Amino acid sequence: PDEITTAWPVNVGPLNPHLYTPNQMFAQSMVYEPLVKYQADGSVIPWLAKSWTHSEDGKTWTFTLRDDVKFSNGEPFDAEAAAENFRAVLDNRQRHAWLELANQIVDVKALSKTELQITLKSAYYPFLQELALPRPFRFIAPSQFKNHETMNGIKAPIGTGPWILQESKLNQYDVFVRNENYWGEKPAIKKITFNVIPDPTTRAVAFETGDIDLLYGNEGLLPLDTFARFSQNPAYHTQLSQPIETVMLALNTAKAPTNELAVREALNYAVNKKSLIDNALYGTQQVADTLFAPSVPYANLGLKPSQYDPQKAKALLEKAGWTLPAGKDIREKNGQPLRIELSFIGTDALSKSMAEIIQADMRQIGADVSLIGEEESSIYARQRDGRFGMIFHRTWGAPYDPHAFLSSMRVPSHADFQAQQGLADKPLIDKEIGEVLATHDETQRQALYRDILTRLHDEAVYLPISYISMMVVSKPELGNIPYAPIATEIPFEQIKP
Numbered sequence: 001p002d003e004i005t006t007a008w009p010v011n012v013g014p015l016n017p018h019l020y021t022p023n024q025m026f027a028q029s030m031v032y033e034p035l036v037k038y039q040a041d042g043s044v045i046p047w048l049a050k051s052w053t054h055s056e057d058g059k060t061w062t063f064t065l066r067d068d069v070k071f072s073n074g075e076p077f078d079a080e081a082a083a084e085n086f087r088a089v090l091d092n093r094q095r096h097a098w099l100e101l102a103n104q105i106v107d108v109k110a111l112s113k114t115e116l117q118i119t120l121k122s123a124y125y126p127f128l129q130e131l132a133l134p135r136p137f138r139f140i141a142p143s144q145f146k147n148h149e150t151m152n153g154i155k156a157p158i159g160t161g162p163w164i165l166q167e168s169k170l171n172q173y174d175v176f177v178r179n180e181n182y183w184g185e186k187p188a189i190k191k192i193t194f195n196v197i198p199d200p201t202t203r204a205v206a207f208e209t210g211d212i213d214l215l216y217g218n219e220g221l222l223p224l225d226t227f228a229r230f231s232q233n234p235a236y237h238t239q240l241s242q243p244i245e246t247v248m249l250a251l252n253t254a255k256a257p258t259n260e261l262a263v264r265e266a267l268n269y270a271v272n273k274k275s276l277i278d279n280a281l282y283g284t285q286q287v288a289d290t291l292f293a294p295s296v297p298y299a300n301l302g303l304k305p306s307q308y309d310p311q312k313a314k315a316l317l318e319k320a321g322w323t324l325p326a327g328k329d330i331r332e333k334n335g336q337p338l339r340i341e342l343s344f345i346g347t348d349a350l351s352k353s354m355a356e357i358i359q360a361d362m363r364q365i366g367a368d369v370s371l372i373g374e375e376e377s378s379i380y381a382r383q384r385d386g387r388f389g390m391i392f393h394r395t396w397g398a399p400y401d402p403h404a405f406l407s408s409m410r411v412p413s414h415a416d417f418q419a420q421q422g423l424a425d426k427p428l429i430d431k432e433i434g435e436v437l438a439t440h441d442e443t444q445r446q447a448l449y450r451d452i453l454t455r456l457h458d459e460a461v462y463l464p465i466s467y468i469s470m471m472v473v474s475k476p477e478l479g480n481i482p483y484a485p486i487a488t489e490i491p492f493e494q495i496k497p
């Protein structure tokens with residue numbers, strides 16, 4: 001009644017606050033809390049820190065912490081505990097290279113039980129927003145460190161947050177209960193069970209049978225034809241949010257033939273995205289023209305969409321010397337076919353479905369796209385080392401878009417650096433991305449984001465496909481289901497059956 005059952009494709013993991021997969025970002029956020037909390041307006045509010053000041057140069061920050069917070073095991077949260085957590089995360093600094101605050105923090109010390117001082121290398125504007133992310137800058141009770149560190153594992157996953165992990169059964173379920181000694185508001189729901197159900201169809205069946213009360217997730221949550229049917233079923237409740245992030249292809253500028261601007265521009269006119277969404281996504285998502293939607297901060301730039309126009313795609317290819325051999329449908333230039341490999345996760349039906357549309361659309365303009373559907377690990381290896389022609393990719397949602405997504409483009413083991421590696425202006429873009437993050441001058445900040453996103457758009461590095469939404473299917477008795485400000489969090493504490 002005040003207990004709900006839901007599902008997730010895998011277990012939540014050990015819930016080490018400072019590490020990554022197999023820990024799940026939404027479950028880390030249930031147990032662990034940040035110094036400051038992200039809000040839908042892009043600001044942060046006081047959270048475990050009640051207030052803060054910064055030096056004139058923007059480099060030294062002092063937070064005054066709450067004094068009434070306890071970890072769920074009764075141990076105090078105080079500045080020493082916070083400082084030991086920062087030391088634990090930065091004792092594994094290289095693992096957090098993707099997040100620029102991990103390279104910016106020069107020192108963290110507790111000045112007293114309530115005063116915590118953080119010194120940075122530069123006036124890093126996204127500081128507070130970085131501290132608000134699900135990981136790694138949360139807080140586990142230091143008693144639960146293993147040999148005074150977390151990077152080699154933790155003991156019990158003891159946080160300060162509104163949920164406590166009750167128990168986990170690998171490949172079966174995870175059970176959380178509400179923290180009866182939480183410092184903030186008590187959740188209405190007392191117990192949440194997560195059934196581990198990896199397949200989307202099996203998740204929809206589990207809901208139809210009543211085995212689960214709630215499904216919450218992105219466009220991969222359940223089959224979208226089924227979701228549309230459920231939205232008309234008066235026994236159920238469904239929701240579809242406003243878009244949270246972009247799904248796009250990344251095109252390899254460093255690999256023939258996507259190394260040619262004219263080829264990438266042509267590809268960007270070849271796909272009818274509205275058709276793709278109505279055909280493969282059941283009409284449930286929005287067309288994307290631009291790496292970031294115009295509603296994203298700093299990204300309303302009047303960039304010019306490449307609308308579906310196969311006549312233009314062909315013209316661009318022909319002018320570039322890619323013409324059709326007698327009796328053949330695939331173009332050739334300097335003897336070579338216009339062949340491009342598109343890699344995706346082979347077991348993800350929706351990805352496959354999507355890939356097949358893209359392949360068909362680009363044969364219509366004389367490009368031979370070859371589908372390479374592989375297991376997850378192999379696709380992640382291809383992202384990291386640039387072994388792809390085109391690969392599916394997506395942005396990260398608030399509060400990561402755009403600043404953290406752009407920051408990451410500089411990390412060589414990420415798909416975006418690899419896709420961009422062939423650009424003459426790659427070093428200028430990376431220099432500009434470092435500059436934009438440390439700008440105090442609001443005018444210069446906007447000008448640097450315009451230049452970076454305009455170069456990425458004009459160089460046709462991406463093929464934006466969709467802005468996708470978060471979707472919910474629920475038993476009606478749970479009521480309206482809220483969304484969280486951070487796109488990877490699930491706001492269970494806000495559900496009030």
Ligand SMILES: O=C(O)CN(CCN(CC(=O)O)Cc1ccccc1O)Cc1ccccc1
Pocket residue numbers: 020021025098135136396397400414415488
């Ligand atoms: O991982 C995070 O905390 C955030 N992630 C930080 C980078 N990741 C570091 C890693 O996972 O090792 C590696 C990473 C790189 C490229 C795409 C996805 C990734 O998870 C990005 C993210 C944001 C929102 C939703 C999903 C992923």
Ligand SMILES: [Cl-]
Pocket residue numbers: 227228231
């Ligand atoms: Cl619908």
Ligand SMILES: [Fe+2]
Pocket residue numbers: none
């Ligand atoms: Fe990640």
